[PDB]
UniProtKB/Swiss-Prot annotation, chain E:
Transmembrane parts of this sequence: none
Protein name per UniProt: Small ribosomal subunit protein mS38
Basic residues bias locations: 5-22
Residues shown, of full length: 78 to 109 of 111
Coiled coil (residue ranges): none
RNA sequence: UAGGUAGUAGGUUUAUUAAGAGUUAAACCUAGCCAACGAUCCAUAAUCGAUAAUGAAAGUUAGAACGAUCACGUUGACUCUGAAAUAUAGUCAAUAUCUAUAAGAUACAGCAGUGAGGAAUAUUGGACAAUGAUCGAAAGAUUGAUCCAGUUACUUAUUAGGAUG
RNA sequence: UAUUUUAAUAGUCCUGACUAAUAUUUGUGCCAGCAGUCGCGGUAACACAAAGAGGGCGAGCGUUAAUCAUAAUGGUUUAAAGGAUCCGUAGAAUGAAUUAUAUAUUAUAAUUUAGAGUUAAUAAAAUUAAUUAAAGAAUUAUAAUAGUAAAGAUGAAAUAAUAAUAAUAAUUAUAAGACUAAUAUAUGUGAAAAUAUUAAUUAAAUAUUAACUGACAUUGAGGGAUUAAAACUAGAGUAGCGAAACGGAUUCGAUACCCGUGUAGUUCUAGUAGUAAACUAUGAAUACAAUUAUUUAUAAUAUAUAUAUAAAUAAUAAAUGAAAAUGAAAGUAUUCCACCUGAAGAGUACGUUAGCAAUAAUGAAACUCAAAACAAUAGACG
RNA sequence: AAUAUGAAUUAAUGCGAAGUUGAAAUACAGUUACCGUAGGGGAACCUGCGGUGGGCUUAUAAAUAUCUUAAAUAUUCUUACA
């Protein structure tokens, strides 16, 4: 769901601007993968399962009887009075999906513009969804895989 | 505008390029016959007695033209070559007559910017 | 003020900062590119020590607003590599610098 | 604010004032006269320090900034002279300290306003002869000569080729006394090249910058991850810089590891020649689609970028 | 818009109304 | 230009062609088909490139010149040869000119050139020497294709004096 | 003891700024004229016409006619521009979660309930639409009783009504049309237009819980319905107000503002038309973002009103903005629809469609110009 | 049937100074302006019904105030009494 991803991107933007430390995003495989990639690359302090009221300290089993009341809880970082996650926005909008071949991905990382997509800036990563998995664009190039560019997070 | 509207036609407007010499029919110049020679008063704030000629081009459309220089031999039934350009002060005239072309002689005793007005180079060698 | 420069030559990455009615789009440049920017920005850069840049000004082109916007953009819009690495917990490497190293 | 400004000297000079109406002189002309000094019956401006040519291997270039425009010096005493009220010349009241000590970089800089231009060093005839022998007589590699003497491979190849020309011009006894005087005069005009000295030696680790290495790239990796030049080569898809340095070291004609036998696998047929035939034909195999003149090609004859070339005899031919 | 262009449009509408009122007879004649 | 279509959409058979096909001719059925993402109608235009101009680029313009494709050889229809022509053939119809007054001949969108139109675009030139094309067993013959030259600053390039003073 | 001769004549545009060109001088004086834009010339002309000097391009220079580039890495409260409102069809528009396959961001199958709905129970409301049935005070007209000479309006008078019954004012009796006082905030409800004297019939609307369903949703070209006041077509009614008209006033005039008589209209039934400063000058929907104060509803912890969640309003942080300011948005994002590309011409002409008509919808081009427009600042003026 | 070119006399509109007739708008513009619509007038405009503020948010008092050791004690205290 690209609508949910766009909503989370705006939500993370707002929370970082008001400088809160804990935040909630929906429970979905796409969101979990997106958040965990952010967490690996160093934009989130901690990722946790949990309900609508707060993160769960102990192990909890997710069931249809409680699927509705599940939200992932993310922790944003700050440093030298500047949020680390400044801007995060989509590339492939829900109305215009972008599926780039691997060569175009390499061209994007090189510095050229493909499909009116601004190139990869320093301290930036473009997440790509290939075969139901979200990964950094460099990993897709190395893995030779192909897919749609999803978002930029700076 | 939604991309659905862009694909339906919406987008930046192409910069309009209106021709300032419509009656020339996309030609650098055209012949004509001076039906009348008139002196008109410039619009404010300029004040002068500007010499203009009413000319009928070969297309079949009459246009107003401005005779430049100091002293002209324009008169009725004079074959002149009308070009582009507009006399800004006079409202309505949007063409110029090429001095030195046709029966319109050049500017007498013109010694600077001759080609713009029509004049052989004095040798004096 | 103090303006961070990449290799004392150019800005870090691209900047798309907006000052009131002035849309500053600035992008980095190759070594030996020259200041291919608007004259106001060119003067600001030449006095600030920036030598290679490229950009375009959109919407309002008021000179004074442009000058204020570009100074601010240099100051805060851009971020240095070291600061990103520290706040990220990751390592950013300049391929150009490490290709020509020993 | 732009205006036309006559190029009056920046340094102060005496300006003509009340003058006879029948002189018709200009401040620029009197500035030149003050700078050159008197012209003698032979037409020589002996006073000017730049009239002569140095013979001490130290170039004598213009230093207008350091000498405040005082270009006059005694030909023999080599001491400053300036105009006085009486119109004569003599020692200045004080000594100019800036002229006293000049950095070597300034000595080698010919133009005051360009500190990035320096004059190369003239190699001694002995060094050229030694290079020639070692390349030819000793049968060594130009790479070795470059490494020992610090010169470039193109330079050493040029040295040997020019020395061969000099020998040919010598055994014909064609070089006249005038050429020898020219060489002697110009030899003492520029510094000699001392292979021992490090700062005169030219760097041999110079590589042309490929277009791709001039483009900035950045990777975000685990901090612990070691990144080296070879990984940069892989990500930039270029040969490692050290390897490119090694490759260009072998392109010299006399350099080690050189071979140009690539184009020896094309079928070429020479046609038979009979008596009375003024020409012979060579037939070189060329695959269809790769040979011949294109149909519908571009005609740049009437355009600004028309191709102009030269044939073997040197005639300008529209290629 | 302001009261400037509003005044201009008002006058144009008024003139059009009067012009169409005077030409009532001609309109009727031309339309039978 | 808001409704259009009536061989129109489809099905079955027969007829010509080497061939399918309402492409054409004949018979019988079904009631369809296109259309506000623009039908039908009207006006305009020869189309394109690995061609020319421009821009950082996506693009935008021209279609002169090199090449590719289409249509025409004053206008319209028909016919024999062939695999292919509605042929620059012929017939017929139409227009203008000429002499031979005849089911007469020609139509400079082949070269050169003339009058007009226009702001504007060239010689009523030399040779088949080279590359091709046609006829001929061959010798050879023809070639305004083609190769050259002339007019034109329309375009591009080179040159159109250095040192001293 | 030599080995032919021998030179070199560039034009064209500009010098106020955009735009490189400071060495000054003369002629004309809003004339002659120059000009791509701003503009120069009425005695200081760096701009016209020239001399000196200078700056470009160069066998070319200039000018005209054309092509490309020069800003959408845009906007619609106040500057061009949200449709009057909603319902809804197509959409080659967008749109939930898990798992398994494939030809992989798409499809198929299964499963799930966070969107979206259906039905019951519990609690509060008497609002909106339609149709009936009633109430209130006045106003005008007529009549009577007494009762006088003046009454009515205006800044002041006259036009219209008085001692001819005899007014005006007061108190009674009758008829009629229209409207709805506090409450009152149009609060609130309604899709908008609208909506507050009372009762009744029909229809719709809120929150919580239980169950049910299973992505059945959002937007919505075209289309459909409703749409103030004025206007028109028939039929009833016409008290008061009141275009037009006629009189009286002020003014030099007064085709008006003030006063009198006052027709259409204004009122009910059935219709036509579908327009407004139809305005929040702000289309609908979804996720999210920091505080405060006041009301409304829900929940039992209570001991007898403290505590948490929703909505509205008002003031703000951040953000946005040309600023004034917005502040569940005019902020951060996503989706869909409508509209804008300088002013004047012009929502005009022509055509078409629809109406009984007034008219409504659609909707150009020619001529002219370097204008035109919003926010805010400082004066001057009232 | 469509298209184009004319057509007596005639309706808009633009342009240049330019006088005549009023004073309609900007301030409370001297009758608040404007939107829709109907009627009237030499011309702006006037009047009638509803709507908007792109005018009144320009918003700013009916009023009354109190008792514990008044100091031999708080008011001082500069790292030590605690
Ligand atoms: Mg500026
Ligand atoms: Mg200048
Ligand atoms: Mg507007
Ligand atoms: Mg009309
Ligand atoms: Mg009739
Ligand atoms: Mg058939
Ligand atoms: Mg048929
Ligand atoms: Mg048939
Ligand atoms: Mg069509
Ligand atoms: Mg044609
Ligand atoms: Mg094309
Ligand atoms: Mg074309
Ligand atoms: Mg061609
Ligand atoms: Mg033919
Ligand atoms: Mg012909
Ligand atoms: Mg034919
Ligand atoms: Mg024929
Ligand atoms: Mg010909
Ligand atoms: Mg020509
Ligand atoms: Mg031949
Ligand atoms: Mg040339
Ligand atoms: Mg001039
Ligand atoms: Mg003067
Ligand atoms: Mg000028
Ligand atoms: Mg001049
Ligand atoms: Mg001169
Ligand atoms: Mg010159
Ligand atoms: Mg563009
Ligand atoms: Mg909007
Ligand atoms: Mg609206
Ligand atoms: Mg509107
Ligand atoms: Mg629900
Ligand atoms: Mg009474
Ligand atoms: Mg009430
Ligand atoms: Mg309300
Ligand atoms: Mg609404
Ligand atoms: Mg399902
Ligand atoms: Mg809807
Ligand atoms: Mg609709
Ligand atoms: Mg109302
Ligand atoms: Mg009636
Ligand atoms: Mg009344
Ligand atoms: Mg009245
Ligand atoms: Mg209706
Ligand atoms: Mg409207
Ligand atoms: Mg703020
Ligand atoms: Mg914004
Ligand atoms: Mg805005
Ligand atoms: Mg209309
Ligand atoms: Mg002007
Ligand atoms: Mg204002
Ligand atoms: Mg004041
Ligand atoms: Mg006429
Ligand atoms: Mg007034
Ligand atoms: Mg008024
Ligand atoms: Mg009236
Ligand atoms: Mg309203
Ligand atoms: Mg006002
Ligand atoms: Mg106000
Ligand atoms: Mg307010």
């Amino acid at each position: 769901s690209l609508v949910k991803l766009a909503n989370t991107c705006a939500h993370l933007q707002n929370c970082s601007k008001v400088r809160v430390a804990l935040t909630s995003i929906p429970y979905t495989k796409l969101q979990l993968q997106f958040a965990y990639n952010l967490y690996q690359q160093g934009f989130l302090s901690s990722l946790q399962k949990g309900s609508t009221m707060g993160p769960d300290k102990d192990f909890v089993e997710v069931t249809p009887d409680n699927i509705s009341t599940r939200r992932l809880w993310v922790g944003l970082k700050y440093r030298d009075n500047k949020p680390v996650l400044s801007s995060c926005k989509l590339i492939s909008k829900p109305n215009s999906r972008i599926h780039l071949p691997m060569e175009d991905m390499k061209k994007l990382c090189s510095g050229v513009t493909i499909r009116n997509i601004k190139p990869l800036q320093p301290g930036e990563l473009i997440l790509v969804r290939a075969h139901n998995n979200i990964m950094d664009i460099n990993e897709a190039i190395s893995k030779k895989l192909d897919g749609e560019v999803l978002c930029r997070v700076k | 505008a939604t991309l659905n509207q862009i694909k339906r036609g919406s987008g930046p407007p192409r910069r309009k390029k209106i021709s300032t010499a419509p009656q020339l029919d996309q030609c650098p110049q055209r012949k004509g016959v001076v039906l009348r020679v008139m002196v008109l008063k410039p619009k404010k704030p300029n004040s002068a007695q500007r010499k203009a000629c009413r000319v009928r081009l070969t297309n079949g459309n009459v246009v107003s033209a401005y005779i430049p220089g100091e002293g002209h031999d324009a008169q009725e039934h004079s074959i002149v070559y009308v070009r582009g350009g507009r006399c800004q002060d006079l409202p309505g005239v949007k063409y110029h007559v090429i001095r030195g072309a046709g029966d319109l002689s050049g500017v007498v005793n013109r010694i600077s910017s001759r080609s713009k007005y029509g004049a052989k180079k004095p040798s004096k060698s | 003020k103090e303006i961070p420069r990449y290799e004392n030559r150019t800005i870090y990455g691209d900047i798309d900062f907006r000052y009131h009615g002035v849309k500053l789009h600035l992008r980095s440049a190759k070594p030996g590119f020259g200041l291919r920017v608007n004259h106001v920005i060119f003067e600001i850069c030449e006095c600030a020590g920036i030598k290679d840049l490229s950009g375009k000004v959109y919407k309002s082109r008021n000179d004074m607003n442009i000058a204020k916007g570009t100074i601010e953009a240099f100051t805060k819009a851009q971020k240095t590599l070291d600061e990103v690495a520290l706040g990220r917990g990751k390592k950013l490497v300049d391929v150009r610098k490490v290709y020509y190293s020993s | 604010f732009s205006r036309r400004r006559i190029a009056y000297p920046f340094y102060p000079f005496k300006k003509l004032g009340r003058q006879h109406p029948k002189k018709h002189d200009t401040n620029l002309k009197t500035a030149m006269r003050q700078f050159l000094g008197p012209k003698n019956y032979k037409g020589e401006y002996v006073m000017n320090k730049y009239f002569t040519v140095p013979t001490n291997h130290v170039p004598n270039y213009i230093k207008p900034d350091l000498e405040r425009g005082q270009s006059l010096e005694h030909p023999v005493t080599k001491k400053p002279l300036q105009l006085r009220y009486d119109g004569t010349l003599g020692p200045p009241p004080v000594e100019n300290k800036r002229l006293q000590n000049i950095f070597k970089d300034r000595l080698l800089q010919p133009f005051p306003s360009n500190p990035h231009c320096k004059t190369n060093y003239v190699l001694s005839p002995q060094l050229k002869q030694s290079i020639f022998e070692e390349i030819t007589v000793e049968g060594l590699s130009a790479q070795q000569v470059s490494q020992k003497y610090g010169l470039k491979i193109p330079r050493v190849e040029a040295i040997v080729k020019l020395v061969s020309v000099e020998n040919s011009w010598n055994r014909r006894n064609r070089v006249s006394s005038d050429l020898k005087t020219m060489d002697e005069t110009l030899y003492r005009m520029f510094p000699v090249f001392d292979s021992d000295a490090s700062f005169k030696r030219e760097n041999l680790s110079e590589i042309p910058v490929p277009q791709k290495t001039l483009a900035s790239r950045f990777l975000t990796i685990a901090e612990s991850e070691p990144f080296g030049p070879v990984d940069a080569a892989h990500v930039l898809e270029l040969e490692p810089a050290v390897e490119t340095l090694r490759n260009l070291s072998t392109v010299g004609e006399h350099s080690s590891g050189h071979q140009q036998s690539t184009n020896k696998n094309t079928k070429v047929i020479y046609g038979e020649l009979v008596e009375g035939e003024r020409s012979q034909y060579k037939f070189t195999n060329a695959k269809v689609g790769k040979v011949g003149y294109r149909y519908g090609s571009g005609n740049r004859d009437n355009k600004k970028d028309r191709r102009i070339g030269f044939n073997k005899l040197g005639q300008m031919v529209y290629i | 818009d302001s009261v400037m262009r509003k005044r201009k449009k008002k006058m144009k509408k008024h003139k059009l109304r009067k012009r169409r009122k005077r030409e009532k007879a001609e309109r009727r004649k031309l339309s039978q």
